[PDB]
Design a protein around this ligand. Sequence first.
Ligand code: E7F
Ligand code: UDP
Length: 453
Amino acid sequence: SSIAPHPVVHVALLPSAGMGHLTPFLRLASLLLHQHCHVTLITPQPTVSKAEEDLLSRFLSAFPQVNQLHFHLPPTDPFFLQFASIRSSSHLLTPLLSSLTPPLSSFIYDMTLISPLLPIAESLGVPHYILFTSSATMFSFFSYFPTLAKSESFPGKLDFVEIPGVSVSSIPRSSIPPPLLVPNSLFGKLFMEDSPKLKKLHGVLVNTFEGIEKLSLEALNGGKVVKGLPPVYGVGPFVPCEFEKVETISEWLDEQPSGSVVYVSFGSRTAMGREQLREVGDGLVKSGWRFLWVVKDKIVDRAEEEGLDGVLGFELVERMVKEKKGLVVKEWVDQSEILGHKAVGGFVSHCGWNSVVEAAWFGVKILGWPLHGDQKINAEVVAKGGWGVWKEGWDWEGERLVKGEEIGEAIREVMNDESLVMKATQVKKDARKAISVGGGCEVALQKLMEVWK
Ligand SMILES: O=C(CCc1ccc(O)cc1)c1c(O)cc(O)c([C@@H]2O[C@H](CO)[C@@H](O)[C@H](O)[C@H]2O)c1O
Ligand SMILES: O=c1ccn([C@@H]2O[C@H](COP(=O)(O)OP(=O)(O)O)[C@@H](O)[C@H]2O)c(=O)[nH]1
């Protein structure tokens, strides 16, 4: 008895600094657009890196129906500095969010912004959420932090973190993210201020799935970690999207035998010291395997200033050009196009979380080389599933010099192991189940959409 336009579900999104935060937010935006949502994207500007700038430009051109709200920031690790700048200025956003049309339905923001955005979301009167961009196991640690910090000996006497029922049952002190043991650090301060406020959220979205973190997901939603935690929605794996693409790399890969290439990358914001970097190349040559090595000499891509031949040195460059087995680049690559190529049989990775979930989506086994932060916990999430391995004696980047001899031996050990491929293929199979009807991601998004309507 009526011919009416259907009311629109309008979601607002706010990502913080780095490609490891921007990429999952934009993949979530694509998922929401395919559910016929209207999306507003708040963009803090300028970005720390050029790669962030360029990805946003390709996203907006692909989806002109997205409403961009500019967030011009006022004028240490450059990405951590941006985390603090966005957090300290977020209290100014209220006028831009309260005048949104059509009426806002929900608000999903970065995990590092809980405290300043909670009163803003309360005034908007809509359900609000964090998108947590690391593993569900690390989210359990974050939620558990007030339980550990109440002790009078914290953080001096803490040898094991054992959260009931999660995917990594015992986290030793050597795997705790170093800033969490330093009360005055940025993340140590954010953990203490923000974790007690998790109970005010409507929910927590995580880019993960039952095939890789079954136990952590069940413990978080069973009241085992902390009583009164908001529900945790496993909405991963986030499938890589078309707008991310920017041809000699793909042409080189086309000429290599299937499964014969080892891909090497330590993410978008980490650069090894020059001596350690040169040991990586020595290990790749000694391994005897074909390789595609992505190099960074600076944390921030904008700051690169020396050519690859000067970074690598004459002796290493000469060895690699003579053997004619490897390709080395110091530029932004299409990592998902590489991991999805049939030539790539293994992945030497720092185990940043987006890279882990991409490797799971493509069924590529991992040699884990965790370098900083939560990467040792993520490396063990992978090892528990039997589709990758890591050497706990290598330690955080810069604590010791890992030698080319032992790097080459570790590469041969992973590439000769067919059991790792067997488990990685089953992970790949469970990754597709999660997004199909009845899978964890499909079930979670339907729950959220019905609430927002
Ligand atoms: O516990 C986490 C993640 C959970 C969290 C929760 C609330 C919060 O307020 C901050 C973090 C974490 C850490 O304790 C140290 C650290 O160094 C990184 C690293 O964060 C950088 C960002 O730039 C990534 O690039 C890198 O991959 C990742 O390992 C972390 O994720
Ligand atoms: O040359 C590069 C380097 C990185 N990435 C992507 O950048 C992200 C890195 O995020 P992750 O959580 O793995 O680690 P972080 O870079 O934050 O340490 C992933 O989506 C990678 O696929 C890419 O496409 N090309």
